[PDB]
C-alpha cells in the first residue's frame, strides 16, 4: 500500500492520472520522481523546467555540478540526484527528443531505467515538448517497466485520449 490516490489502473504495475507532476510530488513526497531530462541536465522547459522551478533552482545547481564532474548523460540514460523538496530522489531520465532528430527506438532504453526502482512517480517520456507520440510512449512504458509506476499526465485532453485509446 502506498499514498498515491485517484489513479486509474492500466495493468498490474502501471497507474495513470491527470495531474501536474509538480503538485503530485509535493503531496506524495515519493521515494522517486522522474524528470524528463536532457543530456546536459539543463532544466529549461516542460516537466524539467517545472520541477526545477519548484526547487527554487536547487535542482539546476546540483545538476550543473553533476555535469561538470561527469559530463553529459546518454540519450536513453539516467542518473539519480536529490529530490530536493519534492521527493527523496530524482531519477533524471533522457528520452529521445524527436525535435532534435533522435532515435525513437531509444525510448525503450529510457524506460528500462525505471526498473531499478520499486516505485516511481513519472511523466510520459519523450512526450510534450520532446515531440514523440504520447500514445506510443504509454505503450512502451507498459511493455517495458515492470516496477510500480504512477504516471502523471498534464494535459486533460491527452489524459482522456490515452485512457480511451489504451489497449
Ligand atoms: O509527457 C510529459 C508531459 C507532456 C505534455 N504534453 C502536453 C502538455 S504537457 N509534460 C508534463 N507531464 C506531467 N506534469 C507536467 N508538469 C509540467 C509539464 C508536465
Ligand atoms: Cl513537456
- Closest by alpha carbon to 34, among 13, 10, 59, 12? 59
Indicate which residue's Cα is closest to atom 8 of ligand 1.
155
Which grid coordinates are listed for 68?
A: 561538470
Query: How far, in Å, from the CA of 29 to the mean position of ligand 2?
Result: 21
Tally of structural domains, the chain: 1
Ligand 1 atom 12, closest CA: 154
Rg (CA), the chain: 14
Q: Locate cell 503530485: which residue? A: 24
Closest CA to 91 of 113, 70, 108: 113
Ligand 1 atom nearest residue 20's Cα: 14
- Residue 13: give the domain boundaries: 8-163
Task: Please indicate, yes or no, if residue 3 is contained in any of the structural domains.
Answer: no
Q: How far apart are CA 11 and CA 24, in angstroms?
A: 21
Q: Ligand 1 — pocket residues by CB below 6 A?
A: 20-22, 36, 46-47, 50, 123-124, 127-128, 152, 154-155, 158
- Picking from 106, 113, 115, 116, the residue whose alpha carbon sits closest to that of residue 137 is 106
Per the entry, the structure determination technique was X-ray
CA distance readout (Å), 19 to 110, 113, 140: 22, 22, 20
Question: Which of ligand 1's atoms lies nearest the C-alpha of 49?
Answer: 17
Do 149 and 15 touch, CB atoms closer than 8 A?
A: yes
Q: What is the DSSP code (8-state) at residue 70?
A: H
Resolution to 1 decimal place, in Å: 1.0
Domain contains 140: yes
Domain presence at residue 85:
yes
Say if 31 falls within a structural domain.
yes
Q: Give the separation between CA 107 and CA 132, rounded to whole angstroms.
A: 9
Instruction: Out of 22, 123, 132, give the residue to mutate to test ligand 1, the one with the largest number of ligand atoms within 8 Å of its CB.
Output: 123
Residue 2 lies in a domain: no
Amino acid at each position: 500500500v502506498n499514498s498515491f490516490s485517484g489513479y486509474l489502473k492500466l495493468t498490474d504495475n502501471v497507474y495513470i492520472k491527470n495531474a501536474d507532476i509538480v503538485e503530485e510530488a509535493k503531496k506524495v513526497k515519493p521515494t522517486v520522481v522522474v524528470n524528463a531530462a536532457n543530456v546536459y541536465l539543463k532544466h529549461g522547459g516542460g516537466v524539467a523546467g517545472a520541477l526545477n522551478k519548484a526547487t527554487n533552482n536547487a535542482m539546476q545547481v546540483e545538476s550543473d555540478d553533476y555535469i561538470a564532474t561527469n559530463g553529459p548523460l546518454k540519450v536513453g540514460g539516467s542518473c539519480v540526484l536529490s529530490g530536493h523538496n519534492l521527493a527523496k530522489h530524482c531519477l533524471h531520465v533522457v528520452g529521445p527528443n524527436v525535435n532534435k532528430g533522435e532515435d525513437i527506438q531509444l525510448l525503450k532504453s529510457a524506460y528500462e531505467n525505471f526498473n531499478q526502482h520499486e516505485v516511481l512517480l513519472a511523466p510520459l517520456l519523450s512526450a510534450g515538448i520532446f515531440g514523440a507520440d504520447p500514445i506510443h510512449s504509454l505503450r512502451v512504458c507498459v511493455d517495458t517497466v515492470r516496477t510500480n509506476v504512477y504516471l502523471a499526465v498534464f494535459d486533460k485532453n491527452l489524459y482522456d485520449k490515452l485512457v480511451s485509446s489504451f489497449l
